[PDB]
């Protein structure tokens, strides 16, 4: 089965796992730091999605070292995941356009 489509899926499943683990770890890392707001799971999950898509509203963000390290992993996983989907869409268009020319 087409690799680009398989990697896209794998990418989606993996991103969903990173979001959940990131939500868990962000809370674990931020509690104990005075002033921290990334401290309950439901909003932490919203924050992770917010970060992965790189939207970053600024309603929530990490203030501790480990919270930031978790944030980086989430940003990168999201950028990579969506970037991989774009790449797969490119392979589909390239392959089909070849057909449209015969090859």
């Amino acid at each position: 089965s087409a690799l680009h489509w398989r990697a896209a899926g794998a990418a989606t499943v993996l991103l969903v796992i990173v979001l959940l683990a990131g939500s868990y770890l962000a809370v674990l890392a931020e509690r104990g730091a005075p002033g921290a707001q990334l401290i309950t799971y439901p909003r932490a999950l919203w924050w992770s999605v917010e970060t992965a898509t790189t939207v970053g509203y600024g309603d929530l963000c990490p203030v501790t070292l480990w919270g930031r390290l978790v944030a980086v992993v989430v940003m990168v996983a999201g950028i990579t995941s969506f970037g991989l989907v774009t790449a797969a869409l490119a392979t589909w268009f390239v392959g089909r356009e070849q057909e449209r020319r015969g090859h």
Partner: antibody
Amino acid sequence: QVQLQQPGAELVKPGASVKLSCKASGYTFTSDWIHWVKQRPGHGLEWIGEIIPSYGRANYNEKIQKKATLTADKSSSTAFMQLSSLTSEDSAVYYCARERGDGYFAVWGAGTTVTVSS
Amino acid sequence: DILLTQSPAILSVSPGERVSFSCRASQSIGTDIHWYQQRTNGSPRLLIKYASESISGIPSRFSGSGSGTDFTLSINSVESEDIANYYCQQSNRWPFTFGSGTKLEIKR
């Protein structure tokens, strides 16, 4: 059924230490935090600290002298709080409460009355 | 560290009347405020979560409202069983903190 079981009382000699327990039942999730709150007769609720069993990390109220140490035994669903070198100022009712990681204390224990006397 | 002010400390009301407890936060905390009831010799009991959300098992008589820095816990038609201490608690910023408490008193 009672979700958080705490012993009714503990007598402690000044300077000595004691270990309070709080065993849970009912639904337990990876996201649960067990909190400890101190209440002096006639006064209000004071947050002491918290611990997440599924991981084992604990945080404490920074504004007060640290006289507590929290631990959790995953196998017997019990959270413990070690108070050490107590004086009369430590005499109070100590409650444990469970929080599902969403900020509010859904359920509280009956509380353990601790008296520091000779 | 967020400070929660509950004033007045004591509130007197006549049976059946409407009562309101106030809780003021030192800084804006959305609706991350929760209310607890503690009868004499009893442990705290959750009444309202997130400023206005109902909890199952709590008389529909209880309601909360507010957002930002000002919060209100209301009881419509007070009665003897409501005599207790009422506390607000915030979960917006670490560490969680409690208000100083407001005693409900009935005039019969």
